[PDB]
Write a protein that binds this ligand. Structure first.
Ligand SMILES: [Mg+2]
Ligand SMILES: [Mg+2]
Ligand SMILES: [Mg+2]
Ligand SMILES: [Mg+2]
Ligand SMILES: [Mg+2]
Ligand SMILES: [Mg+2]
Ligand SMILES: [Mg+2]
Ligand SMILES: [Mg+2]
Ligand SMILES: [Mg+2]
Ligand SMILES: [Mg+2]
Ligand SMILES: [Mg+2]
Ligand SMILES: [Mg+2]
Ligand SMILES: [Mg+2]
Ligand SMILES: [Mg+2]
Ligand SMILES: [Mg+2]
Ligand SMILES: [Mg+2]
Ligand SMILES: [Mg+2]
Ligand SMILES: [Mg+2]
Ligand SMILES: [Mg+2]
Ligand SMILES: [Mg+2]
Ligand SMILES: [Mg+2]
Ligand SMILES: [Mg+2]
Ligand SMILES: [Mg+2]
Ligand SMILES: [Mg+2]
Ligand SMILES: [Mg+2]
Ligand SMILES: [Mg+2]
Ligand SMILES: [Mg+2]
Ligand SMILES: [Mg+2]
Ligand SMILES: [Mg+2]
Ligand SMILES: [Mg+2]
Ligand SMILES: [Mg+2]
Ligand SMILES: [Mg+2]
Lengths: 58, 188, 142, 126
RNA sequence: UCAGGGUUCGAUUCCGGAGAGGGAGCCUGAGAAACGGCUACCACAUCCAAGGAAGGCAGCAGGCGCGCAAAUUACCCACUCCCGACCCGGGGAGGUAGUGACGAAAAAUAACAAUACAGGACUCUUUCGAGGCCCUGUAAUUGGAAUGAGUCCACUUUAAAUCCUUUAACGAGGAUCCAUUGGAGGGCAAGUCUGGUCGCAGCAGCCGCGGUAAUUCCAGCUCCAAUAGCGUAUAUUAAAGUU
């Protein structure tokens, strides 16, 4: 703590800036739904017991 | 205030009560993927029409047989359901109407029938064919992938008489890549 | 333990239901007229006012923070309310003697969360929203 | 390819001295046909002339080709100059709507209301 | 909105009533207590040569004020009808264009082959292994087609125009002819991934997160939901068998 601990915008005013790394255009409309169908009903590799959440970092 | 206008309109779908239900979610996505639909509103639409047909059928089914109104409206609903081919002519009674399914109406779409009848290489190819004016139902060019195809109309689907795929002048791509031989390698 | 079932008792049933509806809390609150009078809004969804001065409401015991509310005076009534400025460093966008548009907090009459005595939030600072200033999509006009 | 015309619900009208029918234009081809060409073909079909034949309202269907409108054949040019809504005569020169503007007619009338007797300032001097 | 019963709303385009700043009194007329008529009082307010004169947009546009809150001082009697001495005149009634994410219907934003890898059915091989039919990813150069958004000729449309429809001539390689709004502890679909802050800043409808190893704060990456829409405040209905 250094000076007026009740100051506003403290944490958002000392966060390191990061530029967005983006490039590839995301698909839209029917094309996204077609991709989501493939990615879970026909692109599959099954196992007993294991957990397979779509964003699992573990 | 007085004007010669009409204000009659309605909604054609209903959202589901439970918003995040894994089973409903994946069952509606299976149905979107296998019929190549754009939205889920396009599934809720068919669900709504099927629900209204079921409501009318069950409503007529509680009257006593020999009632003139039940006879008239049942013989009309059955005839109108066979006219699109979602019912066998050998069933034709209000008891079999409560046995239909959502994929009897999604089957009879035009996008489905264009692929299934063999004018396209996938349902995702069929949608862009219909939406690009390549398909003709008798003499009419139909732009709409939701055109519910009647029974007798099943024979007559083919390509538009002014379209590259059958008796048509080639499109703007086959006419600049050909001009490439004249204006892309002969004039520039 | 007893209710009149008989065939000519429609008056008794109707009158008893009409008499007892006045013990339901929300029914009485909506049909009496005291809440529409005591409501700092005139029965409206939003309201414009002038900022008197910013304040530091300290949150309730199981939490610790200083919630940074403002003190507004409403144009149409002249009443003095306390409003909340929700975001990280959004209190810098609100000077003194500038008119702000506030709305409700989300419970229709009550304090939300750990904040005591506050029932509204600020949504517009001067014809420009606190969510366009928070993302840089806009900026204050001076 | 070439244009074709065919006619539907034909009716001879002895009370307005004309013939009226629905006109279908078939044109597998390149644009909805000009009115001036349709009245030629009607003339050579019903064998009169292309100056008593009035056609209107043509609209063409989604996906091109068949196009539909309404046509009239007047038994003379005096009867044709008689009934004939004046805007339709002006489609080929037979009438000319000579005036300026509704607001001028309005504001003039309201100045003429404030004088009595010979209104020289507005029957002549505007 | 609703299983059955009910609950809430109806200033608002059709029928009926009432009013023309507030009251009051009348003329003409078949029909008025008429206000696009008249006469007074009250409240406002305009010009004056100060003697006098003149007023009623809750009609169509427009303006000030009030507010959280609502459009052009446009064109035309061509349609629908009304009035008249009348087949001919007139109509801010009404029709037409403009502003318009109140709200309702249709449905663009990528389709298809090759190669490379991956999976599955299969063939033989003791087995490895290999080939081969379908699909899906994925990257690369491709590879060729297909088309409407946009510019735009003529017709068509209409009172005259616009828009749509019909049509020429141009018009795509994905880096732009670039989809958003909310969230990722539970309720409730989706990450114990990486940096920063350290009971502060902040989040959080509710339970609850933050005190130096934060699944919830600030960001980056990834993922989930609906999608040309999505979030928020309030009124109200079902859930409420908590009337
Ligand atoms: Mg008591
Ligand atoms: Mg209480
Ligand atoms: Mg009911
Ligand atoms: Mg009413
Ligand atoms: Mg009122
Ligand atoms: Mg109104
Ligand atoms: Mg009556
Ligand atoms: Mg007034
Ligand atoms: Mg009279
Ligand atoms: Mg009066
Ligand atoms: Mg009147
Ligand atoms: Mg007067
Ligand atoms: Mg008036
Ligand atoms: Mg007005
Ligand atoms: Mg204002
Ligand atoms: Mg509005
Ligand atoms: Mg305003
Ligand atoms: Mg008229
Ligand atoms: Mg006239
Ligand atoms: Mg009007
Ligand atoms: Mg809509
Ligand atoms: Mg786009
Ligand atoms: Mg329009
Ligand atoms: Mg986002
Ligand atoms: Mg968030
Ligand atoms: Mg995060
Ligand atoms: Mg959650
Ligand atoms: Mg979950
Ligand atoms: Mg840390
Ligand atoms: Mg961390
Ligand atoms: Mg209720
Ligand atoms: Mg209650």
């Amino acid at each position: 703590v250094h000076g007026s601990l009740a100051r506003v915008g403290k944490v958002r005013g000392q966060t390191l800036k990061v530029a967005k790394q983006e490039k590839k255009k995301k698909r839209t409309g029917r094309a996204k739904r077609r991709m989501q169908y493939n990615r879970r009903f026909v692109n599959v590799v099954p196992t007993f017991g294991k957990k397979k959440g779509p964003n699992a970092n573990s | 205030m007085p004007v010669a206008r009409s204000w009659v309109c309605r909604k054609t779908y209903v959202t589901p009560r439970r918003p995040f239900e894994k089973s409903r979610l994946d069952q509606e996505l299976k149905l979107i993927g296998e019929y190549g639909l754009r939205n889920k509103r396009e599934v809720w639409r068919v669900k709504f029409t099927l629900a209204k047909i079921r409501k009318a059928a069950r409503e007529l089914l509680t009257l006593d047989e020999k009632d003139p109104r039940r006879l008239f409206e049942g013989n009309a609903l059955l005839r109108r359901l066979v006219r699109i081919g979602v019912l066998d002519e050998g069933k034709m009674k209000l008891d079999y109407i409560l046995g239909l399914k959502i994929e009897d109406f999604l089957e009879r779409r035009l996008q489905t029938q264009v692929f299934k009848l063999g004018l396209a290489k996938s349902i995702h190819h069929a949608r862009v064919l219909i939406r690009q004016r390549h398909i003709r139902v008798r003499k009419q060019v139909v732009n709409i992938p939701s055109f519910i195809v009647r029974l007798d109309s099943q024979k007559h689907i083919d390509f538009s008489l002014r379209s590259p795929y059958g008796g048509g002048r080639p499109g703007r791509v086959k006419r600049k890549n050909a001009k490439k031989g004249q204006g892309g390698a002969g004039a520039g | 333990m007893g209710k009149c079932r008989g065939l000519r008792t429609a008056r008794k049933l109707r009158s008893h239901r009409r008499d007892q509806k006045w013990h339901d809390k929300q029914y009485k609150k909506a049909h009496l007229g005291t809440a529409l009078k005591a409501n700092p809004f005139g029965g409206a969804s939003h309201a414009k006012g002038i900022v008197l001065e910013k304040v530091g409401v300290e949150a309730k015991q199981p939490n610790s923070a200083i919630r940074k509310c403002v003190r507004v005076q409403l144009i149409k009534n002249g009443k003095k309310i306390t409003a909340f400025v929700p975001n990280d460093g959004c209190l810098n966008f609100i000077e003194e003697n500038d008119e702000v548009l506030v709305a409700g907090f989300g419970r229709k009459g009550h304090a939300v969360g750990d904040i005591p005595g506050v029932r509204f939030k600020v949504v517009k600072v001067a014809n420009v929203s606190l969510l366009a200033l928070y993302k840089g999509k806009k900026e204050r006009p001076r | 390819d070439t244009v074709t015309i065919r006619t539907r619900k034909f009716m001879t009208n002895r009370l307005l001295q004309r013939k009226q029918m629905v006109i279908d234009v078939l044109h597998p081809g390149k644009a909805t046909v000009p009115k001036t060409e349709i009245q030629e073909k009607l003339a050579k079909m019903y064998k009169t002339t292309p100056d008593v034949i009035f056609v209107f309202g043509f609209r063409t269907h989604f996906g091109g080709g068949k196009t539909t409108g309404f046509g009239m054949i007047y038994d003379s040019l005096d009867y044709a100059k008689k009934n004939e809504p004046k805007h339709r005569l002006a489609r080929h020169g037979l009438y000319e709507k000579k005036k300026t503007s509704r607001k001028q007619r309005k504001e003039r009338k309201n100045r003429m209301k404030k004088v009595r007797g010979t209104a020289k300032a507005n029957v002549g001097a505007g």
